[PDB]
């Protein structure tokens, strides 16, 4: 009774890979499928050792290890389109390392992933990332503001938004995040009422709020 015979009728739904530690790794595509497999192993239908894995869990695990041994490495995401040969995207600007160091890093990653034959490291451009983000928000016609910091870019989308706008935004952001991850660019989406709650005011360095006719309030520059 092979393991593939136990996972189901839809043979193409799962992928079995042998690992150097003498263990079978069942790669899955989503949570629902992950739990469909884990139930089979946890029930004990199979009798040797086996494990279930997916891209999100592995990205978390590897990030946690990097936090300890390479606490200043600037990177984006690890892609597992080909689970036998992952691709790791590093920033070209914000990292200074030699070719030798990169090779060492590669070998240590290979030690963390006993199902992978090698890890390919690719250098990506920050300007490219930022440009795709701003082009996406323009193409979708959302109102936004951009803030720049040394380590990152932030886009603030806030105010009174219509249903159509909210839907477009959610779809786009979900698409972007799956490519670039959430380390360099952050999108803040916040529904605001009217800033001042239907009250007249004067803006600028001498601004003030009219609480009511005959009643002035001086909170701040506006």
């Amino acid at each position: 009774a092979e393991l593939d015979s136990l996972l189901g009728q839809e043979k193409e739904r799962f992928q079995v890979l042998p690992g150097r530690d003498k263990m079978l790794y069942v790669a899955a595509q989503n949570e629902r499928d992950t739990l469909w497999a884990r139930q089979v192993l946890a029930r004990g239908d199979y009798d040797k050792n086996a494990r279930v894995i997916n891209e999100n869990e592995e990205n978390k695990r590897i990030s946690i290890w990097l936090d300890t041994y390479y606490p200043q490495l600037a990177y984006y995401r690890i892609h597992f389109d080909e689970p036998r040969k992952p691709v790791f995207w590093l920033s070209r600007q914000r990292n200074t390392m030699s070719k030798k160091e990169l090779e060492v890093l590669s070998q240590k990653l290979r030690a963390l992933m006993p199902y992978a034959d090698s890890v390919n490291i690719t250098l990506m451009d920050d300007v490219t990332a930022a440009g795709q983000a701003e082009a996406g928000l323009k193409q979708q016609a959302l109102p936004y503001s951009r803030r720049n910091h040394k380590g990152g870019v932030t886009f603030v989308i806030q105010g009174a938004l219509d249903d159509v706008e909210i839907l477009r935004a959610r779809q786009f952001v979900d698409s972007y995040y799956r490519t670039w991850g959430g380390r360099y660019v952050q999108f803040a989406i916040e529904l605001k009422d009217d800033w001042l709650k239907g009250r007249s005011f004067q803006y600028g360095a001498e601004g003030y709020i009219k609480m009511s006719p005959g009643h002035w309030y001086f909170p701040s520059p506006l």
């Binding site: 239907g198 007249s200 004067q202 803006y203 600028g204 360095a205 001498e206 009219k210 006719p213």
Partner: peptide
């Protein structure tokens, strides 16, 4: 209103509007 200085009226009586204009 990122720049300068102005007034955001909400069905305000002209007395309160031109009073706000008085400083300029």
């Amino acid at each position: 209103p990122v720049t300068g200085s102005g007034f955001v009226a909400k069905d305000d009586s002209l007395r309160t509007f031109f009073d706000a204009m008085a400083l300029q």
